[PDB]
Amino acid sequence: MRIISVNVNGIQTAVERGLLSWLQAQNADVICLQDTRASAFELDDPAYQLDGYFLYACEAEVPAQGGVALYSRLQPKAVITGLGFETADRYGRYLQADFDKVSIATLLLPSGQNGDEDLNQKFKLMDDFARYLDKQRRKRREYIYCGSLYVAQQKLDIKNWRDSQQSPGFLAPERAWMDEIVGNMGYVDALREVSREGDQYSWWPDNEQAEMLNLGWRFDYQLLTPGLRRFVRSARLPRQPRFSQHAPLIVDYDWTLTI
Secondary structure, three states, X not given: OEEEEEOOXXXXXXXXXXXXXXXXXXXXXXXXXXXXXXXXXXXXXXHHOOOOOOOEEEOOOOOXXXXXXXXXXXXXXXXXXOOOOOOHHHHOOOEEEEOOOOEEEEEEOOOOOOOHHHHHHHHHHHHHHHXXXXXXXXXXXXXXXXXXXXXXXXXXXXXXXXXXXXXXXXXXXXXXXXXXXXXXXXXXXXXXXXXXXXXOOOOOOOOOHHHHOOOOOOOOEEEEOOOOOOOOOEEEOOOOOOOOOOOOEEEEOOOOOOO
């Protein structure tokens, strides 16, 4: 019924935060990010059962901080945890769900908790990523890029000037990053396109939650293909810390993946 996105360091903690209460709340279409935490075959356990949903996802260095989570109603066929053989078993930050139509890519990679380390691993990935965007144009089908990177329009989060980009300062490649993607008039910002957060309040901020606290970005971009660009029913963004009945980054519109 929607696309939910929440990156945590222990999905287990997500459920303790009510996230699970949200996947049963609307039987979301595809829930991306989070962090498997659990094994690759202990998760689907009936314990994680909800209202009625399937579970597809991989793990890398989980006893470290890996786990690409993707809950789907249907049964996807294309499950990729990165393209590096062993690396995939160690990335847990690259997984797409596809079959024949509508290829979605779920990429979780926190930068605030990492930093320079991401700018390096992301760099190499950047070259391929740009090539992918290009590899995406070649495809005549539709696709969804829902990941957690340091992408900030900078025109709507001018408030979080601090890390609005990634760190207390700012990144030069950022301006060209978001511009080269949406200035492409191909990538829509269903996040800030349908919903405006330029003029909003700000509750007493604390830890990294300060960003997500409708004051900044904690790395959560919901990108659609020019196939639905003008088909965004709504976009509910979090304004309160994920500790109770708070709502994750959800998007109302196209749901359920057909294969």
